[PDB]
């Protein structure tokens, strides 16, 4: 047991939200899971805690001076389905160095055990942009062993996915972290399913699942909760449960095989029209 995963993807593509709901389905399956938010905005855990956690690793550490003076109890809280949640702190937009925040945070958890438990899964909900080595912390030597890139059939989202893949390569070769697959969070693009599958193949991975765009996600989001909790009978809920099973049963872990910009354009023209 114990599978550390890292979620990445185009900014605002829905990684946080999807991860939130996904984990809910895991918890519903009796799977003990912990989610480590790696976004300066502690928004990786709202749907589980039913509230925007303020006890972030960085802010908390600052209160007690040195991060060394911090203690897990103060930053780790369990929410829906007993899912444990932790949030790397972060400066407000346009100031500081959020990257370092994540670095220190991950190191903190590592040293205070945290992972050291009976957790079935650990999810690193990283920010969309990932502009530095710091945000790649979850993909280091002995952290996440499987990454899942969220994206849509949108040119930009696909580029981001491929671009992110490139960065992953540097870490895949130096360790054992592998790309499990792509999770298409539908954004109603024309030949969406075909597009993502095409890209997935080109990269050498798979399209783990196609999450339909359903406003239920938002309706539940508004009420601070995952679709599962908000409406277990909702069609979208089954979709998330499906994705959960897919991830649990996934045995396909590969080293991303990126494509050139020209190759991407070519792919878009062939699978993105009509």
């Amino acid at each position: 047991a114990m599978r550390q995963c890292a979620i990445y993807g185009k900014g605002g593509i829905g990684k946080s939200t999807t991860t939130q709901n996904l984990v809910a389905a895991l918890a519903e399956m009796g799977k003990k899971v912990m989610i480590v938010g790696c976004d300066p905005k502690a928004d990786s855990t709202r749907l589980i805690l039913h509230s925007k956690a303020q006890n972030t690793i960085m802010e908390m550490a600052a209160e007690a001076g040195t991060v060394e003076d911090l203690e897990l109890e103060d930053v780790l809280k369990a929410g829906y389905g007993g899912v444990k949640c932790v949030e790397s702190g972060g400066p407000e937009p346009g100031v500081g160095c959020a990257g370092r925040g994540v670095i220190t945070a991950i190191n903190f958890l590592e040293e205070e055990g945290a992972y050291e438990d009976d957790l079935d899964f650990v999810f690193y909900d990283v920010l969309g942009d990932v502009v530095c080595g710091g945000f790649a912390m979850p993909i280091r030597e002995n952290k996440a062993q499987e990454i899942y890139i969220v994206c849509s059939g949108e040119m930009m989202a696909m580029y981001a996915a491929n671009n992110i893949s490139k960065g992953i390569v540097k870490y895949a070769n130096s360790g054992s972290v592998r790309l499990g697959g792509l999770i298409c969070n539908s954004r109603n693009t024309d030949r969406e399913d075909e597009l993502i599958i095409a890209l997935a193949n080109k990269l050498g991975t798979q399209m783990i699942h196609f999450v339909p765009r359903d406003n239920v996600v938002q309706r539940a989001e508004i009420r601070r909760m995952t679709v599962i909790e908000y409406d277990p009978k909702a069609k979208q809920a089954d979709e998330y449960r499906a994705l959960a099973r897919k991830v649990v049963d996934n045995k396909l872990l590969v080293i991303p095989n990126p494509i050139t910009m020209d190759e991407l354009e070519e792919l878009l023209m062939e699978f993105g029209i009509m």
Partner: protein
């Protein structure tokens, strides 16, 4: 043991048999050091051209650099202004280092503060550090001005110094009118001299930019002078001497000669005389601006010409005969002040010293390093003496500067076997003095280890170091010396000639063997 009457310190002490034996046992017992043979072998290897080549193929490793990061320069620049307190926004560690680095070279106190940014200050961006830091600084050390510089940390996290300072004032942390000039000084860009440049330019902007309307060139009848990164008290003083000697109205911008030479009379003066803020505010009204060390005052040059509209003369650092002549003549032209017979005679005397010593100088090959301007000038003077600057190394040098020096070398037969090296550290030079061995090397204290290395190969391979430059930590008060103008020239000349004679006396001190050439008169 120790003999109370004649106590032996570390040096003679650890030479005592019981101590030697202890070290021998320590070495043989737990050090596992390489056999003396292997050591001797690898050493002889490090002196070959083969090694030197691999040494020069380096693209990442830098060994024994001949430079320092920007902030150091920013600080020195800051110290040149009246009751100004250097403030480095970033990690406190740097400031401690800066202070000590200068402490050791000047053997004087070095006042500088840091707003001590730490872990969370880096993550969250230390705007508070700026606020509290400034308030605390003013209240505690009561400076009239605070010159903000930076640390790589603050440069990476993009801390908007200006925004912070502005907000520091608006939120009542310090009086809105309190002079707080700033400058971004990324450690990882250029070098200490660039820091000096940036810091100066920022200060120049602060007391000028907005108030440029009432300014008129030449109205103050003064000639602005920018020294740049200068670590010889004599260098500031000589310029001021000559200028006053000609009766030239001048204004030395950034003059820390006072701060770096406070008299020890039972009283500690944290701040000392320096460039008054008024001199800075009035600076645009000057006839023109002369940059003593143009090669690292690039940004300032653009600001002076661009904003101050001053037609800065293309003058080289006033080092050696020719360049000092050019400097004086240019100043003479700009101020309309004729070069006094006072200086004319002084020039004549230097020439006389040159003529008296040309015999020993002519032919002596040298290796040297330091800041761009300093080196460039040192080279010119060396050429004027009939010496050969075979290995000219300037770690913080650039492509254009190299060309400049090359042209200077191509202008004289003595530069024939010279080679300019930019972006090269002292380890590179170490190889040069081994492969193509020069007579002496002119540089900062860091070269003492190169001489140690050279001697270890053999006495005839030893290349004596002549301490001229920065920093000089193993010699007391050399920071008082001069290198600029005829005065500086004379000192350098004397120093060189005597250095030559010294080594000769040593080489010929062997009684019966080499003492036959131990002449009383030379």
């Amino acid at each position: 043991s120790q003999q109370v009457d004649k106590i032996k310190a570390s040096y003679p002490l650890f030479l005592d048999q019981d101590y030697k034996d202890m070290l021998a046992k320590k070495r043989d017992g737990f050090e596992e050091k390489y056999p003396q043979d292997k050591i001797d072998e690898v050493f002889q290897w490090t002196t070959t051209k083969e090694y030197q080549e691999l040494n020069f193929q380096r693209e990442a490793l830098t060994v024994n650099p001949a430079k320092a990061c920007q902030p150091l320069g920013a600080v020195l620049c800051a110290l040149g202004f009246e009751k100004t307190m250097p403030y480095v926004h970033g990690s406190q560690g740097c400031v401690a280092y800066f202070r000590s680095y200068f402490n050791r070279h000047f053997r004087e106190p070095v006042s500088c503060v840091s707003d001590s940014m730490t872990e969370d200050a880096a993550v969250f961006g230390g705007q508070q550090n700026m606020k509290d830091g400034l308030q605390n600084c003013k209240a505690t050390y009561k400076p009239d001005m605070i010159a903000v510089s930076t640390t790589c940390m603050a440069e990476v996290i993009g801390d908007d110094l200006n925004a912070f300072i502005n907000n520091s004032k608006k939120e009542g942390f310090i009086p809105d009118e309190f002079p707080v000039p700033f400058a971004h000084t990324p450690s990882f860009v250029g070098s200490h001299v660039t820091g000096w440049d940036n810091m100066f330019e920022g200060i120049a902007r602060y007391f000028t930019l907005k108030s440029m309307d009432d300014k008129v060139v030449g109205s103050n009848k003064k000639i602005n002078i920018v020294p740049g990164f200068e670590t010889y008290l004599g260098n500031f003083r000589v310029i001021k001497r000559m200028l006053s000697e000609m009766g030239v109205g001048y204004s030395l911008l950034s003059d820390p000669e006072e701060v770096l030479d406070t008299p020890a009379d039972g009283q500690f003066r944290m701040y000392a005389g320096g460039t008054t803020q008024e001199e800075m505010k009035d600076a645009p009204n000057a006839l023109n601006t002369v940059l003593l060390q143009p090669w690292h005052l690039e940004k300032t040059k653009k600001f002076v010409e661009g904003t101050w509209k001053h037609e800065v003369p293309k003058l080289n650092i006033p080092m050696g005969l020719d360049w000092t002549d050019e400097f004086l003549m240019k100043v003479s032209e700009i101020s309309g002040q004729p070069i006094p017979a006072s200086l004319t005679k002084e020039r004549g005397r230097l020439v006389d010293m040159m003529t008296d010593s040309h015999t020993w100088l002519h032919g002596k090959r040298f290796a040297l390093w330091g800041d761009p301007d300093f080196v460039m000038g040192l080279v010119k003077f060396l050429l004027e003496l009939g010496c050969e600057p075979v290995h000219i190394l300037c770690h913080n040098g650039n492509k254009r500067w190299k060309k400049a020096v090359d042209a200077i070398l191509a202008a004289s037969p003595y530069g024939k076997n010279a080679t300019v090296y930019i972006g090269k550290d002292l380890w590179h030079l170490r190889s040069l003095v081994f492969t193509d061995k020069p007579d002496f090397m002119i540089g900062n204290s860091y070269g003492k280890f190169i001489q140690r290395d050279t001697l270890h190969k053999g006495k005839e391979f030893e290349v004596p170091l002549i301490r001229i430059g920065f920093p000089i930590f193993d010699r007391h008060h050399l920071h008082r010396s001069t290198t600029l103008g005829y005065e500086g020239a004379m000192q350098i000349l004397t120093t060189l000639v005597n250095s030559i004679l010294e080594r000769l006396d040593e080489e010929t001190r062997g009684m019966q063997a080499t003492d036959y050439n131990h002449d009383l008169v030379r």
